[PDB]
Amino acid sequence: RKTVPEFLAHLKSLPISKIASNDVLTICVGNESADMDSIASAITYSYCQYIYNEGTYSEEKKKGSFIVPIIDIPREDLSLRRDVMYVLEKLKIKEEELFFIEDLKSLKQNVSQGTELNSYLVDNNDTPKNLKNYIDNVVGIIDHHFDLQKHLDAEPRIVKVSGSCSSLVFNYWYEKLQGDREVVMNIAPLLMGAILIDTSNMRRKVEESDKLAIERCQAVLSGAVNEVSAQGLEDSSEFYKEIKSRKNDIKGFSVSDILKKDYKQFNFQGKGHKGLEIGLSSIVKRMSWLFNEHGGEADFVNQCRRFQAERGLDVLVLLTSWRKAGDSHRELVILGDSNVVRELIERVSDKLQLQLFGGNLDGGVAMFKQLNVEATRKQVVPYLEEAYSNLEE
Ligand SMILES: [Mg+2]
Numbered sequence: 001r002k003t004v005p006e007f008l009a010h011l012k013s014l015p016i017s018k019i020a021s022n023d024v025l026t027i028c029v030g031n032e033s034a035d036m037d038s039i040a041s042a043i044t045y046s047y048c049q050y051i052y053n054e055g056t057y058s059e060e061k062k063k064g065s066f067i068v069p070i071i072d073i074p075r076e077d078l079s080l081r082r083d084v085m086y087v088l089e090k091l092k093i094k095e096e097e098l099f100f101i102e103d104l105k106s107l108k109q110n111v112s113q114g115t116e117l118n119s120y121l122v123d124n125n126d127t128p129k130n131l132k133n134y135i136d137n138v139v140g141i142i143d144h145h146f147d148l149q150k151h152l153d154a155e156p157r158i159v160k161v162s163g164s165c166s167s168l169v170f171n172y173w174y175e176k177l178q179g180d181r182e183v184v185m186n187i188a189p190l191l192m193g194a195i196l197i198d199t200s201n202m203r204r205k206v207e208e209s210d211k212l213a214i215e216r217c218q219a220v221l222s223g224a225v226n227e228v229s230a231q232g233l234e235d236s237s238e239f240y241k242e243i244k245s246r247k248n249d250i251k252g253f254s255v256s257d258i259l260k261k262d263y264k265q266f267n268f269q270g271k272g273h274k275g276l277e278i279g280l281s282s283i284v285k286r287m288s289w290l291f292n293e294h295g296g297e298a299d300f301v302n303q304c305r306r307f308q309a310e311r312g313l314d315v316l317v318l319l320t321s322w323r324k325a326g327d328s329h330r331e332l333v334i335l336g337d338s339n340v341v342r343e344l345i346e347r348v349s350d351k352l353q354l355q356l357f358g359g360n361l362d363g364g365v366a367m368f369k370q371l372n373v374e375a376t377r378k379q380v381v382p383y384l385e386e387a388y389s390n391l392e393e
Pocket residue numbers: 037038123144164165166
């Protein structure tokens with residue numbers, strides 16, 4: 001049985017007609033942000049399906065084509081996720097063994113012309129917008145984000161609370177594989193990379209799914225022992241510190257890089273039939289740090305406006321978060337048409353406890369301390385959707 005890198009290399013070595021079956025090519029893709037969770041989840045789903053299909057858990061229930069895991073960014077952008085690069089290096093997964101947007105385009109182009117391209121979704125529950133023209137059918141979903149209630153016939157269809165999607169993927173496959181210890185060993189570093197970064201080392205956003213996934217990994221990684229030592233948890237701590245420091249490291253990146261490396265885009269519907277195109281960048285350093293590293297406030301804001309225009313956005317929002325002295329802090333910066341941004345912010349400012357520190361809503365660029373440190377992009381987006389629905393048009 002192949003390890004994860006061996007499986008990926010094997011996929012790369014095959015003709016596309018041996019990956020597709022009866023003129024269906026099946027993939028598994030995460031979300032447009034391509035974070036640790038999206039990448040770990042997609043690779044894990046694809047790998048577990050492969051092991052399941054060739055083994056004896058799937059005796060008298062046959063079938064089962066290969067699933068190509070896709071990371072939904074240009075290959076070159078992987079390097080902006082220094083945490084992910086570290087986890088892959090540790091499992092000896094080479095970038096040339098992975099499949100990015102370019103690879104998915106090559107597959108679509110080189111497959112026979114009547115082949116359907118179907119997708120499992122992990123770490124999202126509707127198809128990333130940029131892939132809507134490539135994916136014919138959604139066949140299955142496992143996710144932990146707000147349920148959009150689409151593709152209700154998907155199999156599986158798991159959209160449940162979880163610190164990490166990777167926990168849900170792992171647990172689903174663990175049951176189907178009857179706890180196969182070799183599989184657990186082979187995926188645990190990648191899985192733990194996602195779970196630990198998502199839960200800040202099992203201290204935040206922890207759900208029953210995460211606790212169970214961690215318990216299963218510990219049981220395998222410890223093996224038969226008389227006494228459980230502190231070593232396993234110490235090793236998880238050192239691993240977490242390595243990944244966290246790297247996620248927190250955006251030194252040397254351009255403003256464009258920083259804005260695009262953890263980014264999501266939406267079209268909100270309002271009272272007008274025209275929607276609001278809005279992008280949200282999640283960033284790991286405070287605005288003052290960003291300004292100092294990028295030629296000062298004015299230079300930085302100009303680069304933001306450039307990014308906005310390039311992505312065709314009515315509104316660009318930056319959400320920063322950091323920790324110092326055991327205290328969490330957040331900021332929210334918004335750029336867009338003065339009319340719309342003032343109305344949006346005025347409608348969410350109480351809930352997010354926003355305090356202006358820069359700019360002016362009448363000017364279309366404004367910067368706020370966000371004293372509601374619990375609200376992440378996952379909450380900010382619904383708050384802004386609700387605000388936008390109340391605007392006159
Ligand atoms: Mg996730």
